[model samples]
Target: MGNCISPVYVDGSSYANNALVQNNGSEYRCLVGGWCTVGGPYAPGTGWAWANAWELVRSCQAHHHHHH
Candidate 1:
């Protein structure tokens, strides 16, 4: 019913610890420090090694109104 909980996790962008990124309609929080900055394997859900650097926060609550 509102905008995305946070920015979408960029495929190859860097993120900070505790940073929140949304992917696949869900949000993830960065766990490790350096690991959060890496992409691919750390791009939240769907990434091969995302579990090592990310923690599932919660599902996005966005509805019909797109905020992009």
Candidate 2:
């Protein structure tokens, strides 16, 4: 199959704790899942946050451009 659909939630999700997701040209890595046993939230910027799997998608501005 040529169609590719994985490693992302509808676009990005279900990846490892350190996996990266893209949004607005920026990248975000899952800090941790929402649980009372392991690390979580890593940090949700300021106000935003997730429950069940509070895996915050940390942002890392894209500074790469491919062109000639």
Candidate 3:
């Protein structure tokens, strides 16, 4: 999972292609198994924070099933 510094305002417009969904701060929405990217460049200018979040998403997906 990528380490997001500002979860509330982390824009992901640049990597929309890799992103599973539109910009959203909620982990459930962005990193809830099959809802977020597994490996790719995170939100730019955030110090790879988004990448950390992605990892978390993958982990959550592996542990349990995420509804959409």
Candidate 4:
């Protein structure tokens, strides 16, 4: 997998529509307002009702370097 450069979602960060964020081993894009501004109940993948606020983009690539 290639490196995922999307920044990790931060709680309380103001995200507009279609803002992409990485969390919980996955990447999600903000789908709506209000919900995107908070965490916990709105955290990208794990948040309750998160699907209403975000859309799953894809699995996040591991950032760690593995010289296999």
**Residue pair clashes in candidate 2:** 8-12, 8-13, 9-12, 9-13
How many residue pairs clash in each candidate at the backbone level?
Answer: 0, 4, 10, 0
lDDT of 2 by residue, 1-68 (tens): 32222132222234554333333223334344322113233533421243233333433443455565
Model 1: lDDT to the true structure: 0.58
Better of 3 and 4 by TM-score: 4
lDDT of 4 by residue, 1-68 (tens): 44455577766665666566766657756666566655463333443364567655567665666465
Which should have the higher lDDT, number 2 or number 4? 4
Q: lDDT (CA) for every model shown?
A: 0.58, 0.33, 0.34, 0.60
lDDT of 1 by residue, 1-68 (tens): 44345577764565556566765566666666466556454333443364576765567755656665
Mind sharing the TM-score for model 3?
Answer: 0.15
Worst 10 residues of 3 by lDDT: 54-63
Pick the winner on lDDT between candidates 2 and 3: 3
RMSD of 2: 10.1
* Order by lDDT, highest first: 4, 1, 3, 2
TM-score per candidate: 0.49, 0.28, 0.15, 0.54
- Model 2 bad stretches (over 4 Å): 1-14, 33-48, 51-68
Worst 10 residues of 4 by lDDT: 41-50
Q: TM-score winner among the candidates?
A: 4
Go through the candidates in order and give the C-alpha RMSD of each one to the true structure: 5.5, 10.1, 11.6, 5.3
Where in model 4 is the C-alpha error above 4 Å?
1-5, 41-51, 65-68
- lDDT per residue for candidate 3 within 1-68, as digits (tens), equals 45333232234333342343323233323443332445333534121364443422322222354567
